[PDB]
Amino acid sequence: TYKLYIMTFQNAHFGSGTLDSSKLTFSADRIFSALVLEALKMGKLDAFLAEANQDKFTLTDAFPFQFGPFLPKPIGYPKHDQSVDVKEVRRQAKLSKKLQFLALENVDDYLNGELFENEEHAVIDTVTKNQPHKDDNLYQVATTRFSNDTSLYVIANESDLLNELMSSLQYSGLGGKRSSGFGRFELDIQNIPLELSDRLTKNHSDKVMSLTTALPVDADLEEAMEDGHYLLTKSSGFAFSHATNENYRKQDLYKFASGSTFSKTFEGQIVDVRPLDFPHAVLNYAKPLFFKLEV
């Protein structure tokens, strides 16, 4: 709910289920797994999970930051209300699909209908790599290369138990191939504009918009879908661990993506996606910070 953490990457790799592919933003169960894998190195994991199972804190997945915070595209909005000139409105829906991020200065101009030519930050490149003199040695890493002014900003409760972890993620990296150069950034904690923190609710039964990959608790998951307009994003992967000598997958969680609009806000949960017969839990953060649309 509190201050938002601008993070200037200039180089990243963000998943998308493979290594040939890369997102633009990094899906806040990744930043939670980064904080847990950083607090495990410090021996700070117990107090961090104690902080992490409270109503006090939040997390929120990344969004682009060009001189101001950006928001997801509200999925399902704008609803129709101008059904003419097929030649250009059929051409625009190929372009208005690839927008997916809006500034706060016009996010309520979007719910009323505006065209919003997609700005160009962070070309998602690709490079072929190798391992010399070996058998099959041509993997291809999709670089996310930010445009020298764009940052990512998780939104959280500013606590020093977490701010030490966030200051150490400056130097440990945050992304796909952290050891080979990707994902490492510089943090800058800034305050929130008054037209954003006014809308960051968590319990307002109203037309609302999720701002992380969330997963409702089953009493609220029934009619989270009766009005929700969402994606599912399939948060899978292998569970990282220093106690395997093997490679086991996580439990393949499906979560409502960011920008999923709702009515009647819900309550998320820390979904233990631990493998069967596995020593320590694998946590997979899904509890949402929301956003009021018409309030």
């Binding site: 021996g43 070309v123 130097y171 952290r178 050891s179 150069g181």
Partner: protein, 207 residues
């Protein structure tokens, strides 16, 4: 205890660099092998995986039976040694504003080259895009002094440092048996960022 000391250096290219990228298109007159560049600023980069792999393939020549390369570079197997303690980084051409003061139009030269048949004696030309000489690139290399490895930090400093003399004495790039290497590190200082660790016992072992 926990710290993260970084090894800042200016790298220096005493011959060119050809770290290749993706092979786009021949385009008869254009460059056959273009150097990898930074796609926002169109500027020559060293990707950190090239530094990391070349340093690993030199130190692995020095240390054969290993156990010390695995903890400093990582290992997919052997649960102790995943994400092994070193986090390299791309190298971003710090003196863009200085090389044009030395008088130059681009930061990458195009070296023409050929291949001569042994019997037919007919040439086969090439244009290889190298980075120019004495481009100086940024460099940092996070070493994480975590809780467990406290007794063995200094025997992981005589290996990080010994892996830099090798890059000064091997080529660090592509096609480096024909020149195109000779990369010398300078101002190799080890500062500490996010930690409580004293590096006044290391910066004399570096210089």
């Amino acid at each position: 205890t926990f710290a993260k000391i970084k090894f800042s250096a200016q790298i220096r290219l005493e011959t060119g660099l050809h770290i290749g990228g993706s092979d786009a298109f021949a385009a008869i007159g254009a460059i056959n092998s273009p150097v990898i560049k930074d796609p926002i600023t169109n500027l020559p980069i060293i990707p950190g995986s090239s530094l990391k792999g070349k340093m690993r393939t030199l130190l692995a020549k020095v240390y054969n039976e290993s156990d010390i390369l695995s903890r400093l570079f990582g290992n997919s197997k052997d649960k102790r040694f995943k994400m092994g303690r070193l986090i390299f980084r791309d190298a971003f051409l710090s003196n863009a504003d200085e090389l044009d003061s030395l008088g130059v139009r681009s930061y990458t030269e195009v070296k023409f080259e050929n291949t001569i048949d042994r019997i037919t004696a007919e040439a086969n030309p090439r244009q290889i895009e190298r980075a120019i000489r004495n481009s100086t690139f940024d460099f940092e290399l996070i070493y994480e002094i975590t809780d467990e490895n406290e007794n063995q930090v200094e025997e992981d400093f005589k290996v990080i440092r010994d892996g830099l003399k090798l890059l000064e004495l091997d080529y660090l790039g592509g096609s480096g048996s024909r020149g195109y290497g000779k990369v010398a590190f300078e101002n190799l200082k080890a500062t500490t960022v996010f930690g409580n660790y004293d590096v006044k016992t290391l910066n004399e072992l570096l210089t």
